Amino acid sequence: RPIIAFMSDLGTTDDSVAQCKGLMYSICPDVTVVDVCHSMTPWDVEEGARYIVDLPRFFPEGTVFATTTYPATGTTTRSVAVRIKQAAKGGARGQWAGSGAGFERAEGSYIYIAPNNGLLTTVLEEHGYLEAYEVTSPKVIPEQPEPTFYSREMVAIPSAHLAAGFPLSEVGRPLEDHEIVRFNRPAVEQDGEALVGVVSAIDHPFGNVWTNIHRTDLEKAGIGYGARLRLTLDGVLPFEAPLTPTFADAGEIGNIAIYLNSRGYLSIARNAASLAYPYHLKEGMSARVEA
Amino acid sequence: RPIIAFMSDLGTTDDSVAQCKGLMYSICPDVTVVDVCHSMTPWDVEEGARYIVDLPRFFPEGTVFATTTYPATGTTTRSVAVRIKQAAKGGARGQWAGSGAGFERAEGSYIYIAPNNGLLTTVLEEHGYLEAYEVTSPKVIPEQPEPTFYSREMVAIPSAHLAAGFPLSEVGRPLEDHEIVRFNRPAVEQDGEALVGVVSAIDHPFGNVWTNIHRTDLEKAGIGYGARLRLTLDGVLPFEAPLTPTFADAGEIGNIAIYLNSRGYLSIARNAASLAYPYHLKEGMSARVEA
Amino acid sequence: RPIIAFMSDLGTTDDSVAQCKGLMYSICPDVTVVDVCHSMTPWDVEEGARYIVDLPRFFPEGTVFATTTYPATGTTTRSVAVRIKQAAKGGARGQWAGSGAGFERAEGSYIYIAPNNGLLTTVLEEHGYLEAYEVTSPKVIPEQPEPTFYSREMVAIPSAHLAAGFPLSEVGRPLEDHEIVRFNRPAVEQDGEALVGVVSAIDHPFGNVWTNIHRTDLEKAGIGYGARLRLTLDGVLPFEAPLTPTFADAGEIGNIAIYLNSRGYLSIARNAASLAYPYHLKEGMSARVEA
Amino acid sequence: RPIIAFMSDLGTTDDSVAQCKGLMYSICPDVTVVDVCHSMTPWDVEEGARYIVDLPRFFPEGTVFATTTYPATGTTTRSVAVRIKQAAKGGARGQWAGSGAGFERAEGSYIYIAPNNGLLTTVLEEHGYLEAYEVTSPKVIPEQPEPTFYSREMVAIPSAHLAAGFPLSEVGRPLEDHEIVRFNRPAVEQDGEALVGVVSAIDHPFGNVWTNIHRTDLEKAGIGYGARLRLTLDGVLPFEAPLTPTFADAGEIGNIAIYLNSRGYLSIARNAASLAYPYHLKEGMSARVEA
Amino acid sequence: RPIIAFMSDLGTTDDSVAQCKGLMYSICPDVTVVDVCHSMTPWDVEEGARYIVDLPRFFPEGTVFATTTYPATGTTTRSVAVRIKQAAKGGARGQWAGSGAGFERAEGSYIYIAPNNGLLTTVLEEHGYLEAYEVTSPKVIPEQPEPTFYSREMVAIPSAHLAAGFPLSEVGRPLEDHEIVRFNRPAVEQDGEALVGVVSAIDHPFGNVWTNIHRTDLEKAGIGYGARLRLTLDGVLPFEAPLTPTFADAGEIGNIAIYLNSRGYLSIARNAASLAYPYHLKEGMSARVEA
Amino acid sequence: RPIIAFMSDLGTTDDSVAQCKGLMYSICPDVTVVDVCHSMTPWDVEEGARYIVDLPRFFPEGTVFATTTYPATGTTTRSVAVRIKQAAKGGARGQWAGSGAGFERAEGSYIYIAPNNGLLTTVLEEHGYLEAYEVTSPKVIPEQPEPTFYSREMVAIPSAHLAAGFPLSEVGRPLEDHEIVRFNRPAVEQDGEALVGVVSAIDHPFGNVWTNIHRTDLEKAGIGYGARLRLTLDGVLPFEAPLTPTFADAGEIGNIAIYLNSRGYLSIARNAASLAYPYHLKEGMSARVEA
Ligand SMILES: Nc1ncnc2c1ncn2[C@@H]1OC[C@@H](O)[C@H]1O
Ligand SMILES: Nc1ncnc2c1ncn2[C@@H]1OC[C@@H](O)[C@H]1O
Ligand SMILES: Nc1ncnc2c1ncn2[C@@H]1OC[C@@H](O)[C@H]1O
Ligand SMILES: Nc1ncnc2c1ncn2[C@@H]1OC[C@@H](O)[C@H]1O
Ligand SMILES: Nc1ncnc2c1ncn2[C@@H]1OC[C@@H](O)[C@H]1O
Ligand SMILES: Nc1ncnc2c1ncn2[C@@H]1OC[C@@H](O)[C@H]1O
Fold first, then answer.
1. For the structural domain made of E1-185, what CATH number should be given?
2. Is F105 helix (H, G, I), strand (E, B) or coil?
3. Closest Cβ opposite residue E74 in set D36, D97, D246
4. SS3 label, residue A233
5. CA end-to-end distance (rounded Å), chain E
6. What is the second-level CATH architecture of the domain A186-291?
7. Which ligand is nearest to the CA of E274?
8. E strands in chain B
9. Cβ-based contacts of F26 with chain E (< 8 Å)
10. Where are the domains positioned within chain E?
């Protein structure tokens, strides 16, 4: 029962994803293809990273993550296939996912395959890796790859072989760490008592505002649930609420909640109302938080 | 062979649904997860209800419906899990779904699990139920649920246990009928000869206009197929057409068709043209029909 | 391991696709339903055709394509079910899909079931067919089909029977060629030595512009890779670039690439930037190319 | 004391109109320049005609109307200057404008100067004319006119000379009637009992809907104030109301009023609410009235 | 040198305002018509009132304000014409307007003529009046007024007569105070020591936000310039700044300024940037201020 | 008969402009106020400059240009009042404006009064100046200026005094050239045979594209009417046409015209169609022209 969890920038409007999947079932008949999402901003590797980084703990060990935005499609670039180390806890607390105490996931239990364009930056940062290979073997990629469709040729296709039991180390040569492209993650800076970050994401479809200010950034400033915060967005929008676990703690529908999102990050929202949408709050806006 | 049909407000733009599915495949390795849709207006329980009420007769017996919009996520609230009674005939004529004479579905064959926020109102109204349980057992939900993600913790996760054969009566204590939250459904009023309802939905992607005026409401003012009807929307934009089975009966493309939709309700459309969109017709607009 | 690849105009916003899938699993329990897309412009048979024409080669043999926009729903019209002949190579070079030299598909290995409304025009043209039948048997369609939902009644339900091994020739009588509705595709017309076609698609989500000017139209005009092209769109907007295999060949991010798409047609893009969106380029705009 | 009323497509966003006015005050120091409007759809002669046809009876005798959209700017074309015959009664009843019994205007009291591109079609149709001259004399136009600004050179400038008392017959040679460009006006057709016209204008800023069905057309099918009428727009959106003098006769705010507008034409509106805007009703939509 | 200052809801897109002006010049040839604005939300008497209430002090004595939105056009309603009492100081400090110490205006120096529909509510409140009359005399209005155009018939035309020296008291009978329709203005309400009002206007084209919280409301709460204010808008968006005289006091371009507008009310802006537009702030949003 | 030509950023939607004008008539009873435009992008001094720079030749000598966007309102900044030197020819040719050979305007014949914020940069660059004074005298400005309305206090008010004959040199102290704020005009660069500039303006309401590439830039590259040009916009849109005097020279409606606009600058448009609007071409886009 192999699983490919499939995240791409291919959209939901044509047969692009179906082509990949058709090939996945062709190569790995017993595969279950699980869509992550296909609507990421094309070529936004940092956004794509966000949709794939917290996946492992939710999936059975041995799951293969075929994750791709491939702007360098048709070039001599080749994908990277990595076996991660830690599946890694997560969420507002830092816990295993599932009922009871959650599913503890073994180490070295997930493979990601992606363009080597930095899409896996946070995956490697947060999970670490045991081994990483360039995907070159004609056994797992086309000998004549479609130039404009490396997401299919260099990710979907080899992902299905990996899911089918194709040995990871046989995809091509091992890559040294410096050969794995990374994008830079701008740090949350200490600017006084304040933590200064950005709006990392508008949380669709709700219009919640996600920051790159992590629980760990907060914990080491002393900020926990109950702490009375000023969260300033866009330089000019204080917001003031206690840090609370959830939206409803804000009381009346529409009230401001400052909370920790399911990924573990400082967030702001309204209670059963959209914060971001009516006021056109966007990713990239500044986010400062002080107690 | 078990099936969970999954309806949420989680959107299709990030890994939220994928996190749920990964846990569903984790808990119930043989499961098939069928998306209903994930694009409902967040927190709009009445709209979510529309997407799930007609589902049972389409699905194999034993299907679990994991249905969720969870505005009260992170609160002490707990989901309700119900075995419905009748799968119930549906459509313009009221029939079993499928080839030949349709597939008759044994009673008690489907479980819904949902926030106990009234999402299941029309499910219970239309199918009845045999048993209802609060979902509280740590065998089916996290001991430390993500405060902001009860749709995962309190729906997706225990739905997978239910699909995996976890005895329904073991999820929590039985709920009495008055403990199951219901929303109020606006009645269709008789106003003289007229029937007064509402545009209950714009039928995307076609821009057909669905009202809450049922066929039973029509055959109460004498109205069957063939009847010249006047249908006014938003109080001002009126329409005249016979009540016909389908769009093409309007004749020319763009012509107004008044019909019964596939859920049995008085609707208005253009034949192979959008009615709602050019005129920005919206859900919530008054709808009056008179013969 | 039966597969139904499912392409409809049903959208992704309600339970319509789920109703179809439920019945698919009801009828063929071991089936895997693979979504192609569901977001096509309703009733645009030419567009629906693009999303289905090059599917066969990507899918395991025996795959059934359930492909439907059904504007004549509720009429006396009946679907056509065809077994196509050659699975047919594609891409910018014309190959079999997959790793290695790709995966050859035996002839007569795929069935399409569709409204008989021309949706299968390009499938038949490109693949040929071995047998075509009207879908009328109450073994495979409802005796009382829902008038407004033939996509489910006359495509979804019967496709599942076909996926389950119901003999194709027993679905109804054989259709002669002339009985299979076709749409006409406008030809690429000559104007001096310029090729005049149309923008056949904006390739979402990338904003690439696809024209109906094929590789054959080009190399029949002595235009090969490396050729300096002037591409005018909408009779106004001119672009000049050499013909190149892929986007990154344009050089800097945002530079114009004129290339052949993964479907084999003259297309235009910005490199890792969206061309169509900032300029509000649309399907149906004229496209003129010249050396 | 001379007045030039100035209607152009020059917009209100730059100094274009101001350049015209400066020259108008330069040439005719005592002049009063009255803006009609400057926001007409560029090059839409029929729309510009609407803005100028009803003007004469409102203005003191001797007023010059400088009316211009000039798509043929910079060509050998020359403006036409005409002394109209009758100032003509107007409105729903047809009357002189002003207090008491209105201000009767002597015949031959108004001059229009315009591109000879049909802008004056309805002016001539409704007022008749006494004399018409091509505007060519270097005493009233630049010897070296700005190619792209004939609205200034060939309208604003000579209009100011005319206001300054430059003899009209001295502007150029007389034009014969066939040399004055006219546009074709769609006739109002009798279709059974119905009258078929068009939405001739959306009446901004109110979103009232003006048709080209005249009161004379109405009192030809027997229709006067009080008559229950059915009015359909865009073929599909029909409306029923008595024909009433004014909006408030509809009773409640938002209620449909069918009336004769201030230019004598069958119109539809809501009472103190916008009709056109919520429904995106547009000029050019068919309009059928039947009693 | 008679002046009519003209404020209507007639828009700037057709000949409506020009028809009025033509008649104004017909009746009072030496008149200067000064446009206030013509773009007010149709029928929004409260909004119309804002554009006219502080005019008198800026205008030469004897100016007539012809001020009209006329939703009850064509009814038995007649306009009111009033001579106001004190021309009344204004601004953020309360002064006479002009160079030097400004220009004092004699009392009883201005006439407003308007629908009797409350448009003059704040004019009367702020200025008082010496005399008020119903406008009925066929000397100043048409005997056959155009039903849909009372703004012209019952405001424009009679204002020109008044501008021309037609005795005010001869326009019709005197109206008692109670006969002059007033609208109610919602009060700034107390909540703790916070002032709760509304966004009374988005100050176009700047995107400044004007509230109905007046200088008096503030310094009645012990809020003076230099006071640190928290201004929450729409019950969501918080801003903090000291109260300052002007925008540039915020410092950097784009910084928040909370200030008193040139009309004397608490307002909020970005310095030389638009506040309202990026945040889609609207008139009618709640505005809460607190020290 | 003094004239104030009045250009501001005050908009057309409230009483702001009327206040200024009221004061202008108060101070200079016999004044004619001529609106330039009031809809400039607030605080965009370069845009405002464009609306005022070519004004003088169109106006009678002695005209006063009250031109203002005043983001530094309420500060210790004071306006500059300048008497220009050359009225300066203009247009595609470089000619005097008016009928015959045009109105030659004497030198030193126009005064501009503006904030000293660089709004007059091009005015001074193109016309030169004879004298310039800071506007400080309480005879021409308020002693207590409205902080947020320096466009009225420091421009409209003193402009009316200047129009009334108030001696220019008495407004305040002479300013040295270095005290007159200028904005930088980026030069058109010679990059080969090419002239590289920008899109300086979208020419509303037509959607023509104006560049800052001047006839003088062209003449000294040898480019005149008839020259076959490639005009590349936005780096990726060649356009190719001869440089022609006017739009119609492009032939068919919608054809590309490259021409010299009425201000003397290289421009591109379609013939009686909008170039900029359908494709969302904007100011600030690159503009290269080569023969
Ligand atoms: N204009 C463009 N530029 C660069 N890459 C593009 C592109 N359009 C699609 N792709 C890539 O092709 C493989 C997909 O993943 C997508 O990122
Ligand atoms: N701002 C908000 N307020 C309340 N509930 C929210 C919310 N954002 C997401 N959810 C709920 O979190 C679980 C999802 O199903 C969603 O309904
Ligand atoms: N207004 C309309 N006119 C014609 N066909 C319609 C329609 N709405 C839905 N359908 C068809 O019903 C089956 C779906 O595939 C869809 O194409
Ligand atoms: N649909 C409508 N309802 C009510 N009044 C209207 C209207 N259209 C224009 N007017 C009024 O006619 C005089 C103008 O001032 C305008 O307010
Ligand atoms: N938010 C703002 N910031 C700076 N100046 C502003 C402003 N709103 C209006 N003005 C200026 O006030 C005088 C007008 O000319 C305008 O430019
Ligand atoms: N692109 C274009 N094509 C044709 N005429 C145009 C044009 N832009 C402005 N004008 C005309 O130039 C004089 C104005 O009145 C306007 O109609």
1. 3.40.50.10790
2. coil
3. D246
4. strand
5. 50
6. Beta Barrel (2.40)
7. 5
8. 3-8, 32-35, 64-68, 80-84, 111-114, 129-134, 189-191, 194-203, 208-214, 228-233, 237-244, 256-260, 265-270, 286-290
9. 58-60, 98, 103
10. 1-185, 186-291
